[PDB]
Amino acid sequence: GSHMEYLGVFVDETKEYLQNLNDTLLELEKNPEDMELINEAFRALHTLKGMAGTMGFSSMAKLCHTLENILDKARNSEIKITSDLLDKIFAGVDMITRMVDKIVS
Protein backbone atom coordinates (compact mmCIF):
# COMPACT_ATOMS: atom_id res chain seq x y z
CA GLY A 1 0.00 0.00 0.00
CA SER A 2 1.19 3.46 -0.98
CA HIS A 3 -0.18 6.95 -0.78
CA MET A 4 -0.53 7.15 -4.54
CA GLU A 5 -2.52 3.94 -4.51
CA TYR A 6 -4.87 5.33 -1.88
CA LEU A 7 -5.21 8.58 -3.80
CA GLY A 8 -6.55 6.47 -6.64
CA VAL A 9 -9.04 4.86 -4.29
CA PHE A 10 -10.03 8.27 -2.93
CA VAL A 11 -10.66 9.64 -6.45
CA ASP A 12 -12.69 6.56 -7.44
CA GLU A 13 -14.83 6.76 -4.33
CA THR A 14 -15.32 10.53 -4.61
CA LYS A 15 -16.48 10.12 -8.22
CA GLU A 16 -19.21 7.75 -7.11
CA TYR A 17 -20.54 10.37 -4.70
CA LEU A 18 -20.27 13.15 -7.27
CA GLN A 19 -22.33 10.99 -9.68
CA ASN A 20 -24.91 10.43 -6.98
CA LEU A 21 -25.12 14.14 -6.36
CA ASN A 22 -25.84 14.64 -10.08
CA ASP A 23 -28.60 12.01 -10.08
CA THR A 24 -30.21 13.32 -6.93
CA LEU A 25 -30.13 16.96 -7.91
CA LEU A 26 -31.69 16.25 -11.31
CA GLU A 27 -34.68 14.73 -9.48
CA LEU A 28 -34.71 17.54 -6.87
CA GLU A 29 -35.16 20.05 -9.65
CA LYS A 30 -38.38 18.23 -10.69
CA ASN A 31 -39.73 18.68 -7.11
CA PRO A 32 -37.51 21.24 -5.18
CA GLU A 33 -39.68 20.57 -2.03
CA ASP A 34 -38.79 16.89 -1.91
CA MET A 35 -37.08 16.59 1.45
CA GLU A 36 -35.82 13.10 0.75
CA LEU A 37 -33.90 14.31 -2.25
CA ILE A 38 -32.59 17.26 -0.21
CA ASN A 39 -31.46 14.75 2.37
CA GLU A 40 -29.78 12.60 -0.31
CA ALA A 41 -27.76 15.52 -1.47
CA PHE A 42 -26.85 16.50 2.06
CA ARG A 43 -25.65 12.96 2.80
CA ALA A 44 -23.41 12.78 -0.27
CA LEU A 45 -21.82 16.15 0.50
CA HIS A 46 -21.31 15.17 4.12
CA THR A 47 -19.60 11.92 3.04
CA LEU A 48 -17.30 13.90 0.67
CA LYS A 49 -16.42 16.32 3.46
CA GLY A 50 -15.45 13.47 5.71
CA MET A 51 -13.36 11.76 3.03
CA ALA A 52 -11.50 14.96 2.34
CA GLY A 53 -10.86 15.38 6.05
CA THR A 54 -9.23 11.95 6.42
CA MET A 55 -6.84 12.88 3.56
CA GLY A 56 -6.16 16.35 5.01
CA PHE A 57 -7.53 18.04 1.89
CA SER A 58 -8.45 21.30 3.58
CA SER A 59 -9.81 23.25 0.65
CA MET A 60 -11.96 20.38 -0.56
CA ALA A 61 -13.28 19.77 2.99
CA LYS A 62 -14.15 23.43 3.48
CA LEU A 63 -15.90 23.61 0.10
CA CYS A 64 -17.89 20.47 0.89
CA HIS A 65 -18.75 22.00 4.23
CA THR A 66 -20.00 25.26 2.66
CA LEU A 67 -22.14 23.22 0.27
CA GLU A 68 -23.41 20.83 2.94
CA ASN A 69 -24.46 23.91 4.95
CA ILE A 70 -26.74 25.02 2.05
CA LEU A 71 -28.40 21.60 1.95
CA ASP A 72 -28.60 21.45 5.72
CA LYS A 73 -30.43 24.78 5.81
CA ALA A 74 -32.75 23.47 3.12
CA ARG A 75 -33.44 20.13 4.89
CA ASN A 76 -34.50 22.08 8.07
CA SER A 77 -36.71 24.35 5.87
CA GLU A 78 -34.59 27.41 6.67
CA ILE A 79 -34.20 28.18 2.98
CA LYS A 80 -35.92 26.99 -0.21
CA ILE A 81 -34.27 25.26 -3.16
CA THR A 82 -34.53 27.83 -5.90
CA SER A 83 -33.03 27.84 -9.37
CA ASP A 84 -30.37 30.20 -8.16
CA LEU A 85 -29.58 27.90 -5.23
CA LEU A 86 -29.36 24.95 -7.48
CA ASP A 87 -26.88 26.81 -9.65
CA LYS A 88 -24.75 27.34 -6.54
CA ILE A 89 -24.92 23.69 -5.51
CA PHE A 90 -24.14 22.41 -8.98
CA ALA A 91 -21.22 24.84 -9.18
CA GLY A 92 -19.77 23.34 -6.02
CA VAL A 93 -20.31 19.74 -7.32
CA ASP A 94 -18.48 20.76 -10.49
CA MET A 95 -15.62 22.36 -8.54
CA ILE A 96 -15.17 19.19 -6.43
CA THR A 97 -15.12 17.23 -9.62
CA ARG A 98 -12.31 19.46 -10.86
CA MET A 99 -10.42 19.05 -7.58
CA VAL A 100 -10.72 15.27 -7.70
CA ASP A 101 -9.66 15.11 -11.33
CA LYS A 102 -6.58 17.25 -10.46
CA ILE A 103 -5.31 14.55 -8.02
CA VAL A 104 -4.89 12.08 -10.89
CA SER A 105 -3.92 14.74 -13.40
How many residues appear in the chain?
105
- Give CA–CA dist 56/33, Å, rounded: 35
Using what technique was this structure determined?
X-ray
Contact 79, 21 (CB under 8 A): no
- Give CA–CA dist 76/5, Å, rounded: 39
Give me the resolution in angstroms, 1 decimal.
1.0
> Based on the number of CB atoms within 10 Å of its own CB, is 17 exposed (0-12), middle (13-18) or buried (19 or more)?
buried
Contact 59, 82 (CB under 8 A): no
Q: Compute the Cα dihedral for 67, 68, 71, 77 and give only its sign.
A: negative
CATH class, domain 1-105, is mainly alpha
Q: Which of the 8 DSSP states describes residue 79?
A: S
> Based on the number of CB atoms within 10 Å of its own CB, is 21 exposed (0-12), middle (13-18) or buried (19 or more)?
buried
Q: Which of the 8 DSSP states describes residue 78?
A: S
CA dihedral 13, 37, 98, 86 (to 10 degrees): 180
Q: Compute the Cα dihedral for 87, 81, 66, 63 and give only its sign.
A: negative
